Amino acid sequence: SHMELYECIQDIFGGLKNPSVKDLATSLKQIPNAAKLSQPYIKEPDQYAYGRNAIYRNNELEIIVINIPPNKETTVHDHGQSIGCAMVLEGKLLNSIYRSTGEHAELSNSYFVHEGECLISTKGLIHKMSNPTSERMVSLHVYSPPLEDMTVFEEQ
Ligand SMILES: [Fe+3]
């Protein structure tokens, strides 16, 4: 069995029923050199400041490939009601946590996650992903359930 990406996704993410942020984190880590399999699903920034490519979906979860060019960031957001886990494939990102504070949001914590490492995005959590490095950052995300309505905040 010489696995291709979608082949791995079905084999790992397809039978999940109500998975936890750690169920998702260990399943992402179960992908064989996910970095190579991920290409060529990586895309250049179209509508967003970052490349975003939805590549899998069911009633349970949703998988997207994200590409944050050097010195680019996402918005400050929550994932509606579906959690997310991501794994930086190649690159290094700064994940900033935000504190709920009205209609705007204040920075609460911040840290880096490197290739092969994941970021957990529990329910209600508000964050921002940026790329301070001079190289691009490619990430493999999983949301459960699929994102329905994220709310973008206007920070402190
Ligand atoms: Fe996010």
mmCIF file of C-alpha atoms and ligand atoms in Angstrom:
data_model
loop_
_atom_site.group_PDB
_atom_site.id
_atom_site.type_symbol
_atom_site.label_atom_id
_atom_site.label_comp_id
_atom_site.label_asym_id
_atom_site.label_seq_id
_atom_site.Cartn_x
_atom_site.Cartn_y
_atom_site.Cartn_z
ATOM 1 C CA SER A 1 0.000 0.000 0.000
ATOM 2 C CA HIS A 2 1.903 3.036 -1.365
ATOM 3 C CA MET A 3 -0.208 5.797 0.205
ATOM 4 C CA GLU A 4 -1.099 9.063 -1.508
ATOM 5 C CA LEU A 5 -2.496 11.989 0.537
ATOM 6 C CA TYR A 6 -6.259 11.522 0.180
ATOM 7 C CA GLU A 7 -5.548 7.856 0.737
ATOM 8 C CA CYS A 8 -4.034 8.721 4.138
ATOM 9 C CA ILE A 9 -6.805 11.163 5.015
ATOM 10 C CA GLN A 10 -9.582 8.601 4.471
ATOM 11 C CA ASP A 11 -7.567 5.961 6.356
ATOM 12 C CA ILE A 12 -6.996 8.272 9.335
ATOM 13 C CA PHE A 13 -9.624 11.027 9.451
ATOM 14 C CA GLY A 14 -12.535 9.275 7.760
ATOM 15 C CA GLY A 15 -13.757 7.157 10.644
ATOM 16 C CA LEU A 16 -13.530 9.831 13.295
ATOM 17 C CA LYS A 17 -16.704 10.573 15.246
ATOM 18 C CA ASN A 18 -16.672 13.549 17.638
ATOM 19 C CA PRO A 19 -12.838 13.774 17.932
ATOM 20 C CA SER A 20 -11.013 15.899 20.522
ATOM 21 C CA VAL A 21 -8.275 18.442 19.916
ATOM 22 C CA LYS A 22 -5.830 15.657 20.886
ATOM 23 C CA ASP A 23 -7.545 13.046 18.714
ATOM 24 C CA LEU A 24 -6.954 15.464 15.866
ATOM 25 C CA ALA A 25 -3.365 16.215 16.885
ATOM 26 C CA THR A 26 -2.362 12.555 17.015
ATOM 27 C CA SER A 27 -4.095 11.830 13.711
ATOM 28 C CA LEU A 28 -2.208 14.635 11.947
ATOM 29 C CA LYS A 29 1.034 13.214 13.323
ATOM 30 C CA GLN A 30 0.089 9.861 11.762
ATOM 31 C CA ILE A 31 0.651 11.173 8.236
ATOM 32 C CA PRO A 32 3.893 9.942 6.520
ATOM 33 C CA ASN A 33 6.057 12.952 5.601
ATOM 34 C CA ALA A 34 2.864 14.939 5.304
ATOM 35 C CA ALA A 35 5.026 17.763 3.986
ATOM 36 C CA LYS A 36 5.626 16.028 0.645
ATOM 37 C CA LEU A 37 2.113 14.627 0.356
ATOM 38 C CA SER A 38 0.665 18.078 1.059
ATOM 39 C CA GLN A 39 2.284 19.544 -2.026
ATOM 40 C CA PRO A 40 0.771 20.043 -4.510
ATOM 41 C CA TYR A 41 -2.304 21.182 -2.644
ATOM 42 C CA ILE A 42 -0.463 24.286 -1.460
ATOM 43 C CA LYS A 43 -1.760 27.473 -3.030
ATOM 44 C CA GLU A 44 -0.807 31.103 -3.378
ATOM 45 C CA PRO A 45 -2.723 33.890 -1.642
ATOM 46 C CA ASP A 46 -5.938 34.506 -3.589
ATOM 47 C CA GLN A 47 -8.724 36.174 -1.609
ATOM 48 C CA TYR A 48 -6.694 36.181 1.611
ATOM 49 C CA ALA A 49 -3.239 37.379 2.577
ATOM 50 C CA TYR A 50 -2.433 33.694 2.793
ATOM 51 C CA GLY A 51 -2.859 30.680 0.564
ATOM 52 C CA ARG A 52 -5.834 28.618 1.654
ATOM 53 C CA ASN A 53 -6.988 25.335 0.140
ATOM 54 C CA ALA A 54 -9.876 23.202 1.405
ATOM 55 C CA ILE A 55 -9.024 19.628 0.391
ATOM 56 C CA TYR A 56 -11.269 17.304 2.406
ATOM 57 C CA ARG A 57 -14.584 17.425 4.192
ATOM 58 C CA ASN A 58 -17.353 15.317 5.725
ATOM 59 C CA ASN A 59 -19.963 15.870 8.448
ATOM 60 C CA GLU A 60 -17.308 15.248 11.026
ATOM 61 C CA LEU A 61 -14.261 17.281 9.976
ATOM 62 C CA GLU A 62 -12.673 19.600 7.450
ATOM 63 C CA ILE A 63 -9.018 19.694 6.296
ATOM 64 C CA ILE A 64 -7.318 22.760 4.776
ATOM 65 C CA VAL A 65 -3.822 23.560 3.467
ATOM 66 C CA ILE A 66 -2.561 26.952 4.531
ATOM 67 C CA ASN A 67 0.352 28.967 3.209
ATOM 68 C CA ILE A 68 1.480 32.119 5.021
ATOM 69 C CA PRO A 69 4.095 34.064 2.998
ATOM 70 C CA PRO A 70 6.887 35.805 4.976
ATOM 71 C CA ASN A 71 5.577 38.650 7.159
ATOM 72 C CA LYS A 72 1.912 37.806 6.684
ATOM 73 C CA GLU A 73 -0.801 36.972 9.196
ATOM 74 C CA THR A 74 -4.366 35.766 9.491
ATOM 75 C CA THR A 75 -7.075 37.753 11.209
ATOM 76 C CA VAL A 76 -7.851 37.460 14.924
ATOM 77 C CA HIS A 77 -10.572 34.827 15.044
ATOM 78 C CA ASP A 78 -12.420 31.968 16.712
ATOM 79 C CA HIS A 79 -13.582 28.914 14.772
ATOM 80 C CA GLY A 80 -17.278 29.310 15.218
ATOM 81 C CA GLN A 81 -17.920 26.228 17.314
ATOM 82 C CA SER A 82 -15.606 23.727 15.621
ATOM 83 C CA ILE A 83 -12.146 23.102 17.066
ATOM 84 C CA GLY A 84 -8.950 23.022 15.016
ATOM 85 C CA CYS A 85 -5.485 21.553 15.133
ATOM 86 C CA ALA A 86 -2.803 22.389 12.771
ATOM 87 C CA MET A 87 0.477 21.139 11.977
ATOM 88 C CA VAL A 88 3.142 23.343 10.490
ATOM 89 C CA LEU A 89 4.484 21.348 7.575
ATOM 90 C CA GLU A 90 7.354 23.460 6.697
ATOM 91 C CA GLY A 91 7.979 26.789 8.276
ATOM 92 C CA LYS A 92 7.575 28.324 11.636
ATOM 93 C CA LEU A 93 4.690 30.340 12.917
ATOM 94 C CA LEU A 94 3.882 32.559 15.843
ATOM 95 C CA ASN A 95 0.495 31.715 17.296
ATOM 96 C CA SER A 96 -0.957 34.589 19.303
ATOM 97 C CA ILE A 97 -3.729 33.901 21.792
ATOM 98 C CA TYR A 98 -6.352 36.513 22.412
ATOM 99 C CA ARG A 99 -8.439 37.373 25.399
ATOM 100 C CA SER A 100 -12.120 38.048 24.916
ATOM 101 C CA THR A 101 -12.682 41.691 25.811
ATOM 102 C CA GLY A 102 -15.827 43.119 24.291
ATOM 103 C CA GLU A 103 -15.930 43.700 20.546
ATOM 104 C CA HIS A 104 -12.198 44.110 20.186
ATOM 105 C CA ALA A 105 -9.642 41.703 21.640
ATOM 106 C CA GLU A 106 -6.457 41.926 23.652
ATOM 107 C CA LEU A 107 -3.386 39.718 23.171
ATOM 108 C CA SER A 108 -3.171 37.137 25.979
ATOM 109 C CA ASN A 109 -0.349 34.752 25.090
ATOM 110 C CA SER A 110 1.971 33.962 22.193
ATOM 111 C CA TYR A 111 4.401 31.236 21.156
ATOM 112 C CA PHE A 112 5.986 29.460 18.212
ATOM 113 C CA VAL A 113 5.140 26.092 16.738
ATOM 114 C CA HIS A 114 7.732 24.547 14.417
ATOM 115 C CA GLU A 115 7.584 21.930 11.647
ATOM 116 C CA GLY A 116 6.058 18.676 12.876
ATOM 117 C CA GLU A 117 4.598 20.425 15.900
ATOM 118 C CA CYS A 118 0.920 21.296 16.231
ATOM 119 C CA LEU A 119 -1.246 24.064 17.547
ATOM 120 C CA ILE A 120 -4.424 23.237 19.449
ATOM 121 C CA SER A 121 -7.442 25.476 18.976
ATOM 122 C CA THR A 122 -10.020 24.576 21.592
ATOM 123 C CA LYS A 123 -13.620 25.745 21.381
ATOM 124 C CA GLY A 124 -14.103 29.498 21.770
ATOM 125 C CA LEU A 125 -10.349 30.156 21.544
ATOM 126 C CA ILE A 126 -9.387 33.334 19.665
ATOM 127 C CA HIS A 127 -6.036 33.495 17.887
ATOM 128 C CA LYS A 128 -3.840 34.816 15.136
ATOM 129 C CA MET A 129 -1.186 33.079 13.113
ATOM 130 C CA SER A 130 1.616 35.169 11.644
ATOM 131 C CA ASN A 131 4.949 34.473 10.006
ATOM 132 C CA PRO A 132 7.908 36.537 11.350
ATOM 133 C CA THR A 133 10.471 34.479 9.415
ATOM 134 C CA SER A 134 11.820 35.263 5.949
ATOM 135 C CA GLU A 135 10.535 31.998 4.480
ATOM 136 C CA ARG A 136 6.935 30.905 3.867
ATOM 137 C CA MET A 137 4.959 28.805 6.338
ATOM 138 C CA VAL A 138 2.806 25.860 5.236
ATOM 139 C CA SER A 139 0.244 24.339 7.570
ATOM 140 C CA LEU A 140 -2.191 21.446 7.531
ATOM 141 C CA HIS A 141 -5.362 22.275 9.493
ATOM 142 C CA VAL A 142 -8.305 20.190 10.671
ATOM 143 C CA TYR A 143 -11.563 21.618 11.973
ATOM 144 C CA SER A 144 -14.314 19.659 13.641
ATOM 145 C CA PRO A 145 -16.963 20.297 12.753
ATOM 146 C CA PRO A 146 -16.317 22.125 9.505
ATOM 147 C CA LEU A 147 -16.105 25.889 10.038
ATOM 148 C CA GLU A 148 -19.494 27.528 9.723
ATOM 149 C CA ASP A 149 -19.089 31.053 11.106
ATOM 150 C CA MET A 150 -15.791 32.425 12.438
ATOM 151 C CA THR A 151 -15.938 35.866 14.018
ATOM 152 C CA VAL A 152 -13.071 38.217 13.248
ATOM 153 C CA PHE A 153 -12.030 40.520 16.039
ATOM 154 C CA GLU A 154 -10.678 44.046 15.911
ATOM 155 C CA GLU A 155 -7.822 43.918 18.408
ATOM 156 C CA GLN A 156 -6.616 46.068 21.374
HETATM 157 FE FE FE B 1 -7.571 29.422 13.050
#
